Design a protein around this nucleic acid. Structure first.
Lengths: 61, 68
DNA sequence: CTTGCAAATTTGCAAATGCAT
DNA sequence: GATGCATTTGCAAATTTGCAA
């Protein structure tokens, strides 16, 4: 993947939220959108996984 | 038109822990910002929208090194 | 899936250091 | 002493976190 656009973002608070979005998305794909196991493989709480999905607008296809 | 060459971050998506990749990205991001402004801390902290005090604390935490 | 709450982490703002001129 | 800076730090508020619902 080309993630060159993250480095073009002027403000850090945006880049941190864009990366965190793309990162989780790719994880959701690698685990066929099995939330329970994703929040486990990345080391967070499932309750916090849902929260990140609502905030960053992630589509659980 | 020419565009500057950017770093390849295809490995950040390979990191296993989310918490881990957030530190690594934040590190690479700040580093590139330092270079782009030739390591002018005061200005870098302004362009990215954080307090200079935090910028120092981030450099300390992420073990970022400066030129001069 | 969402929610509470308390702890843990981070932020901004100022103030206070150092550190040479 | 003083003056310019560039690092540090002391809180309190903001934020994110885990966990048990």
């Amino acid at each position: 993947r080309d993630l060159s656009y993250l480095l073009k973002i002027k403000e850090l608070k945006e880049a941190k939220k864009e990366f965190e979005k793309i990162f989780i998305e790719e994880k959701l794909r690698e685990y066929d959108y099995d939330l329970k196991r994703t929040a486990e493989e990345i080391g967070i709480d499932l309750s916090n996984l849902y929260r990140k999905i609502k905030s960053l607008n992630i589509r659980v296809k």
